[PDB]
Amino acid sequence: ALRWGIVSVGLISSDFTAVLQTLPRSEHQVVAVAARDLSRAKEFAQKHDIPKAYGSYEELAKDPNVEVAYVGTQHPQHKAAVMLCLAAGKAVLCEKPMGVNAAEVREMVTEARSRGLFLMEAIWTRFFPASEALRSVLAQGTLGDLRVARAEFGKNLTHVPRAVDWAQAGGALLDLGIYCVQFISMVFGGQKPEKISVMGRRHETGVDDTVTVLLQYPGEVHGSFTCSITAQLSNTASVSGTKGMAQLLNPCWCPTELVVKGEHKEFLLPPVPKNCNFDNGAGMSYEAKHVRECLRKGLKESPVIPLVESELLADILEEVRRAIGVTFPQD
Amino acid sequence: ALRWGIVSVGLISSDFTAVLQTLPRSEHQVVAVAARDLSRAKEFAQKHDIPKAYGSYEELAKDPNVEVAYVGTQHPQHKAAVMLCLAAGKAVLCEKPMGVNAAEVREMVTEARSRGLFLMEAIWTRFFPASEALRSVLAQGTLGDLRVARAEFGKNLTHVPRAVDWAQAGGALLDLGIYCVQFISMVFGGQKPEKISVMGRRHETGVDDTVTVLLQYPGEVHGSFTCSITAQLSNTASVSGTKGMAQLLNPCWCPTELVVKGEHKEFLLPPVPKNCNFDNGAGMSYEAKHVRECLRKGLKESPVIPLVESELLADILEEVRRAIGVTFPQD
């Protein structure tokens, strides 16, 4: 079994741990959990049936029983936790966005690379059967030559505390834009944009509110997206070429429906678990299964989200928020 | 009755004439028609029950029986036909886009203004009950403070001859972009953009293929749209603020469905006529009825599409196609 250690005990670690505990037991075991104090960790481990509990991440890094660490901390805390894990020899699945700016990402990627160890950013959307089916449509030429891609993700998240906090690097871009960038990047082969234009505005709590971006891609195709922490959007993503459009329906960040040239196709979520903190949370299984296959083949990264692309996604996102003046201390 | 004269006898003049012939007969009469030769005009007049037929537009301009002229010619032929009508004292409803660049529009607007005569661009979408209801939602503050608007209109139109012809000023912008610009302008009070960014590409026949535009509007809100003559898009338009989204469903350029915060509302088309050349063609009635009310109150323009806005829409569109290098002889 792939032996997992869970770093941090917040909402998203719950969902992930819960998902992992539904997988075949000869395939995945949750073996440890760390929090920033011992009691918060004993409670999670009791609630989630994990044999070992730690009051620091370093102690989990050092557990010779953990093979892969899941880093589910909040945005600014990923980098130091990932590095601890990599130094101690663990493969790492890091929550999104892997880092707060590009230099954090290069620094994690370089460590992983130099230590010969697996690192992946948990852009879970990529492993949903509906996204896979979309990649297959693109590979097959079904839409003809491509022309334009589009993504949207906005909700009123102003009452979701850590969504709007300057000190947690929240904001529309880092919470929701990341899904738009990864989608656009995916449809255009992970290629580097030739040019980016941005418009948006700020929110009163120190983060970004609403941001639209235009990306010029090679070969004369382009994307645009819009994200927001105040305005509801349609929350779909599309790609179109000379023979038609393919579209991931709302919710595009955890999609279960693909529409290709008018034809609908549904891809159901696993049955369990059922009361996840975040919607469609059961879909976290797809990436969990993905990390296991990669490790089993001895890969040091995912071909589906390669480290060199995580770096590009972080370059793009930082260029976007620099265009509208939004800075974090880490820059 | 408002006595109409029909300039040009192509597909769109058919639809319009057909619509006019369904209106209360004490409200509208079609009294003449002109074409570039007498036979093409006698045939249309026979087919459409119009008492008088002309082999030049000048002869229709000069008919003292016509009160308002409908100029349904192709893009490059609007300006000379409108001017003939205005010189001869007729009110004019001119098909979209009124002109091929901004100078054509200013020149028509100036003539209309100096002669004390009604001119309107036939942006028919604006008079659809669903668009009216959308304006009302905006006026009521139902979406909260606004944030962002979005529009799309693309279809494969490469087999529609005049859509892709350099010499008819076709292209994505002038055939479909115009609907996106007018929508975006409508949602933001007809205000002038602070800034525009454009990406797109050309089509092999001398026109534009696929174009996306980002418009910065005052008060820290923005729009984006995408149009295309090769790629199918979702063909919807939306606007969102802090309390939700309103959306005109496909087909957004002649909409019958409005979705506001999840709540659907349908607005049926008039019953007749039924086999129009263009979809939802029956909806041309709304603008026809609009021209009559304006003339009855003695207006020299529409408050719904004022001449000063037609000029701004033409400025925007020309700036957009100049950004990607697409020029017509008239520039």
Ligand SMILES: CC(=O)c1ccc(O)cc1
């Ligand atoms: C921010 C985000 O990814 C998210 C996802 C699911 C929710 O139910 C609420 C918020």
Ligand SMILES: CC(=O)c1ccc(O)cc1
């Ligand atoms: C280009 C356009 O406005 C249009 C409208 C309706 C159609 O059925 C086909 C094309």
